[PDB]
Design a protein around this ligand. Sequence first.
Ligand code: P61
Ligand code: P61
Ligand code: P61
Ligand code: P61
Ligand code: K
Ligand code: K
Ligand code: K
Ligand code: K
Lengths: 455, 452, 452, 455
Amino acid sequence: NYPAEPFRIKSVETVSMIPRDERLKKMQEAGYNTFLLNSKDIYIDLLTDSGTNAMSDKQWAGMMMGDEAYAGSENFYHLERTVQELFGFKHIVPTHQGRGAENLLSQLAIKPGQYVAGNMYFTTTRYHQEKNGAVFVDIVRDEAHDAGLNIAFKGDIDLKKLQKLIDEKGAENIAYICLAVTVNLAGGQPVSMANMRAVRELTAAHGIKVFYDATRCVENAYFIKEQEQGFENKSIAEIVHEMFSYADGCTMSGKKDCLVNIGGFLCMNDDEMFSSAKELVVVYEGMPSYGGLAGRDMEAMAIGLREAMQYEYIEHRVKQVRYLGDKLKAAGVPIVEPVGGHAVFLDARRFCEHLTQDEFPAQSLAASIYVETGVRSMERGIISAGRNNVTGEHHRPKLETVRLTIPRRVYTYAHMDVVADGIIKLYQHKEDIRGLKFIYEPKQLRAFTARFDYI
Amino acid sequence: NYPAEPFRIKSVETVSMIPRDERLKKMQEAGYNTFLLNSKDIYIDLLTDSGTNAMSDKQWAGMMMGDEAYAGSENFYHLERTVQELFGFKHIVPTHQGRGAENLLSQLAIKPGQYVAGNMYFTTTRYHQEKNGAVFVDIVRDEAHDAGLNIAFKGDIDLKKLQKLIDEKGAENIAYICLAVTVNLAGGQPVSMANMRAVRELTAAHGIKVFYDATRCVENAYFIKEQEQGFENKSIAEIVHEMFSYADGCTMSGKKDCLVNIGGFLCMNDDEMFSSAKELVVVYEGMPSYGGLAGRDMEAMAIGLREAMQYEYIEHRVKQVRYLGDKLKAAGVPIVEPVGGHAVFLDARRFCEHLTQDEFPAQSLAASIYVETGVRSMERGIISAGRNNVHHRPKLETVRLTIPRRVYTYAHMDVVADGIIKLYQHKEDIRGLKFIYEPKQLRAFTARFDYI
Amino acid sequence: NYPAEPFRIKSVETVSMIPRDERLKKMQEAGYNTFLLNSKDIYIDLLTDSGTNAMSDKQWAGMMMGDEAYAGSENFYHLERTVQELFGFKHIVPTHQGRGAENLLSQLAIKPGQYVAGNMYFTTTRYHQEKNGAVFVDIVRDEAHDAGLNIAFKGDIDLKKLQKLIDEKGAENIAYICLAVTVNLAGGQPVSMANMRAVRELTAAHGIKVFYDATRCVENAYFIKEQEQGFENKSIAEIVHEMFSYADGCTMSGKKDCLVNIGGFLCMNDDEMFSSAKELVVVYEGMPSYGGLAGRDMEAMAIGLREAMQYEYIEHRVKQVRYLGDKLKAAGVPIVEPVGGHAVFLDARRFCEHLTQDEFPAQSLAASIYVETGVRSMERGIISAGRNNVHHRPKLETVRLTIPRRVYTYAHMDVVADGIIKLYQHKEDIRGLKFIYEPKQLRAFTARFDYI
Amino acid sequence: NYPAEPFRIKSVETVSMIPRDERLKKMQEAGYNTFLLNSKDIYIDLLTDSGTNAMSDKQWAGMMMGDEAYAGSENFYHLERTVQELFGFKHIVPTHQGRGAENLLSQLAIKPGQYVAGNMYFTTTRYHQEKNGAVFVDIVRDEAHDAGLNIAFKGDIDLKKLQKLIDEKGAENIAYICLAVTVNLAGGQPVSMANMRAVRELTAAHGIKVFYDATRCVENAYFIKEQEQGFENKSIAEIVHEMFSYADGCTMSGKKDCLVNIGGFLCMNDDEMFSSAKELVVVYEGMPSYGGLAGRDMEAMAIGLREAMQYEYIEHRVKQVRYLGDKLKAAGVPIVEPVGGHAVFLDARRFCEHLTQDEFPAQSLAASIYVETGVRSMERGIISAGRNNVTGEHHRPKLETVRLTIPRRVYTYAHMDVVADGIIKLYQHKEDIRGLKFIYEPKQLRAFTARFDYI
Ligand SMILES: CC1=C(O)/C(=C\N=C(/Cc2ccc(O)c(F)c2)C(=O)O)C(COP(=O)(O)O)=CN1
Ligand SMILES: CC1=C(O)/C(=C\N=C(/Cc2ccc(O)c(F)c2)C(=O)O)C(COP(=O)(O)O)=CN1
Ligand SMILES: CC1=C(O)/C(=C\N=C(/Cc2ccc(O)c(F)c2)C(=O)O)C(COP(=O)(O)O)=CN1
Ligand SMILES: CC1=C(O)/C(=C\N=C(/Cc2ccc(O)c(F)c2)C(=O)O)C(COP(=O)(O)O)=CN1
Ligand SMILES: [K+]
Ligand SMILES: [K+]
Ligand SMILES: [K+]
Ligand SMILES: [K+]
């Protein structure tokens, strides 16, 4: 079932164990917005798995060996050869994080008016595509839009949608296919190796490029080894290397599956695009030999990427998240299924049936979760959806969820029990959860700074 | 039930997940002596809680602020002021670890021929006492020698035994009383504040000194807050400060309850003895301003001692050990009771009743534990007792599962428990061992065995 | 004369002492382009002072206290409060380095077609201005373009040039004034407080904004305390705080005067622009609570900015650079004068007068410097200028010896000086180079050359 | 002449630049005893080269890889194989520092009544020898007792003194020969390889053991490569390995030439003595696999010992000390000659001719040095000599010196100029230096806690 941590604790991080009454005052000061809580006032911070990972002793040893030179740093050569060895790509350009690499790729591979198609989208990835004159097309399988359907590899590309897009618009008007592993918007759902092979075969026949969003590719590789027939004898590294053999490049956020707190990079095989990438990286990030990263951070990301290939680490990572999802599902708590690689999504629509969506149930549930447990979670519903600015009304998503995002190697099963036991107790008196109303609302991105109050 | 860790993991330590077949080869290469296993071949190392603790980010920040000066280091001033504030003693002398402080105290407070009495003994403490011409006398309560008797504060000194020693030998022939908190040999058993208060009252009436072995005094302070009536409203620091108010000094191994990997110190209130301590520390340890420790380590120990005062930390520390003991007891595994603050002791006498004591049951059980789970434990039976005469047979024949602080999780405890529980269901298959290396002095450290 | 380092060495960095014959092979392998040399093959790396600084023990202690949370990190609150205290600005937005802040400001304060005027330009700053539809206008004093003229505060804006721009184009067509302290392209030349005060008076009368390039503002503050009458009794922090009182905001590269290896930020007083900055930072850098930086790096930058305010540190920093410039000038080596705060610029035009500009004298001099001494320097002549049309010929043809902060000693400066002085005594032997790789965009970074 | 530092500064240590008037108040608070000054009030601390060294980035990387296990630590195996490789000894026992190893050796190789002979003595080494029932015999060459005689290898053993001791007392009554490299009491003077060969040849013919005090053996090895004919082509490691080939064991203080802040070890080739050494180390230091050291510190000492073998490091170390001595000698400042490997000794007798020794000129000179420059130095004269307690009078040494001890890789030539320029200015008005009188004097070891005042 659930394996113990395949590591020992080397060093601990001090936290404040403030009681419920103080936590309530902190939440009121934050305007009932978990995004406005201070880190020092949080016991278990499940806001995101991005850049919040715990590094290893080996990584911290590399942090002491930072070659901080502006050009020719040994740390960059270590990072370069590691990615070339594990991912198999020809050229590497480091960036300070994932959206820095997406900014580069979108300016290099998109002519204004072309289409970009992928298995759903991410906010920063789709922004840089649309800012550079592209029109996004969702070609994910229809099953990915059913929150309750428990099936494997929900993130697979629908080959029928891809075939019709090529026929309706033409291969010349398609910039590239953006295949994300895993699919964050669908709940961290993986993509099968068979799907990546079929996508590569169909795109190569029309000369269409394929670039991966490899942000959580290691979690995706474990799902292949666990659930895809024929990969039970292959190591995590062998699966990762085959995944990228069906891609012409990738954007990577090291802050996720590279087990670091900062860092990313951009990969490609084309020499001419790599030449243009080195010219553009100096504008936004830095030299091609550090790309907005300190030398010690390139070293940490190179070591972390190699550590992520260990089967026992990634098995425990995914199964720790699954443990939280299983404990909630066994108690009757409504969650999004299947459980993804990095987070558990509570269905706040069913959790707070007594509240309309205009009362922000996911935002109110997140506030109650913190006060009752000291756990910070992220609202992923109507507040994060924003406002259509042409009309001013709320964007209303089908998913009204609270995201419990698990950083890597930071928490234990006992911490997961604290999260579960508190949510389960809340669910047993879920009728007492009250709604919220705006008291402060910003112009753009309201999820980060809006303030509320009980109705 | 059992609280979650009152901290987050900041950094992790890489371990080798070698399978059982590899572990079997490793144990054979080590000659079935867990003391001879390589650290790199161990998943969960429960050999000792001494110096194996995980430090905090605050402590590691202090590690970057090491003032390595030979005299007048700010790190020493931080350590001195911390101990004076929390322990209440007047003078502090740092030592590289606990037995360095015992060497100093034993040469300063023992006249040849005098008696030293305490609630049981420890190997290093008793050696320096006997090396300096003292005869040890155990004045612990008799119940502390019964592994299965579940009573509170097993480490208390028997006041009747202390009164008889004063009458039979005279107060002039008693060097001092050595009160250890907790009592490691009895299984990490605590001493009540009433016992410390009663001991202070009896010794002061005869002019007899009292020095504490404060190695695990914070674990002792939690047991007082949990189980002694009247201390439920008092903080850990208040209890620690009151504990040492009944002592004339103490020896401390920071490698335990100070949450560090090296370090100790010696405390006292007497000015004249403190003067002699500073003259003797330069012979063995170093200057009184660092005492065999780097500046960064004095800083780490000062910060760790203050972190140990946090109620949530020390509550979780003790209850993680109790979780392992409860899970084993619920399956029928014979252990020493009650569970101490730092370790769970398997009763190898009852675990291997089908084996004679000359068959090294505790040593064979520890070897079997590693092969089955990759967990290293310490033999604490006849092998550790040794042979003065041509075997010493102690009443306690145990295997110690010693838990380092802030290093392992409940899931790691489940690995230990589930493997031992499976081993106990086939305890008839655990065979004895045979001597292969002469027991030169401390045989527990270097002896080799075999049976196949 | 020249003060000793106002600090001790805490830790050292290993270097490779390869002989001249090895360096000659390394330079040939690099194609005589210093930008292509490996760090491991360099003794003294004077390529840039950006991100190459040595941090303090205090900063490394903060590196252990990284609060890596996505929002509400204590490290961000420390950085924000530090900048608000020392710079006096109302709002802070962290960025991963300086050009990240310039990308934000250029999209927020530039309407397409407007003019941006400043005391010369920098490559990354001018790109983001021109990419956002601005036309750059240099309003620095004419003396700043003369490498040999030794006058104080060469970076001052010519108020007459600024007045003519306002009259010829109109204040409505001027986006803002970009005042850099110091002026990197002129050789690290400072700007006087009187000039900043006079600029603020003229721009405010027409409603024109003023934004600083504060990358080396601490070096600029020292020159004011040293050479501007009336500031001899004022501390570095007081001067820095007054400098920014004449600005509406600033872009800062922490990799320079904040004594860190990564990091920057964007400051402003206007609430509405700060709201737009937080919406745009999530697109390129990250959340406004970390802005593309790890928590430990925000903490390191906050501590480094406060360390930069120490008079003894910044005095030694500038005077170590001046020591290198004085030793070269005393031997007759042609340099840019006066010596700036962060680098010494060899005048390759005068150093290699026997060589034409199309022969790449600055590039060939930098290659010869490495082979003779193992010192890497940066070409800052026609190669860095590039070719828009089918070569750009700048008035300054220099080789930059850029000094990282707290990394090297006076003895390292003697190695640089003694080797260049020996090279200058045989400057007739320095030969030209020939293009081998097409100058695709920024040719200074990847072009290769040869002559034998 | 003097080479630049063969390294870059990776990190700096903050110091307080307090002015002269404040420094005077600090010195008065310290009772004019530099031993009582606070570290935070000192610019350049030349009190000792013991444990004050700056570590490298490689060492600090090892500090992140500490295997803190009680037995079988990988760090101990690294340290063990390093010493066996570089020193050539068969068995290694770590100790927390040098005097911990001397405590072990003195209890293992000395029967009560035997003699111990060596090239002068050190305080802690001679104490453990005499505490275990030995009688010390100085067999150094007579030239070592002339402070002004500038000759090479002053620390050599006088073979005539050794031959007469064997004849007058018998080989059975000689515990061992304690050969120290370098000789700290003579001013850091080295021992020639020819002397070590002759000592080994003479002792081996009588079955007498030889144990080295290798505390500063790397500095000693450089002097051999620089000044002993025939070793110009041999590396530092080759010279070190040959030095210990003439010894049966050694005591080592890693706090010196191992480039660490704590640590030591004990070496020997005899299996039976090593067996007894492991039994005795558990009493005083700890297990034979850590010996009173954290795992990270065994790793740092192993890395530092290997770093010390680099010719450029040790050449700069010795020549930085020589630079300070040369600048003082060129200005006419009286110093002890020749300059040793680790310190420059000012001749306070000639520096303060207007003061009698009962006025503590070396102590008063050290106080003036700090007030004028912010440099702490050590008194090495009548105060450190102590009091013959049978009579109560002062011990009066021939040497009345102030020791300027240089930690490794901590200071620059510009720091040496601060020391020199301040002492040179003091020497130009040396008649203004006043004497001191006891106001507080302890029973034993007065150099550490005594307080004074101007006469
Ligand atoms: C599948 C994919 C991502 O998941 C992703 C990031 N994810 C994080 C951070 C995040 C992003 C945007 C928000 O509004 C947000 F509140 C949190 C998250 O929490 O989900 C990026 C971007 O990579 P950078 O973050 O290294 O630039 C690219 N691709
Ligand atoms: C109550 C007390 C201790 O428990 C103790 C040590 N504890 C050890 C380490 C150990 C000691 C001796 C052994 O034969 C042994 F096999 C294990 C242990 O595992 O329990 C010391 C000594 O403190 P030092 O270790 O800091 O010097 C003093 N007092
Ligand atoms: C006055 C100013 C700078 O000097 C500066 C950078 N300085 C560099 C690095 C550099 C930059 C561009 C090059 O083509 C180059 F070859 C070297 C340098 O060496 O001088 C930046 C940008 O700050 P970022 O580097 O933190 O983004 C803004 N303003
Ligand atoms: C030739 C030799 C040494 O020089 C030596 C130490 N020397 C230091 C420290 C010191 C020693 C005694 C003092 O009263 C003193 F004030 C300073 C010094 O400053 O000279 C040791 C001892 O090695 P530990 O210091 O690692 O135990 C053994 N052998
Ligand atoms: K850097
Ligand atoms: K030290
Ligand atoms: K982070
Ligand atoms: K340890």
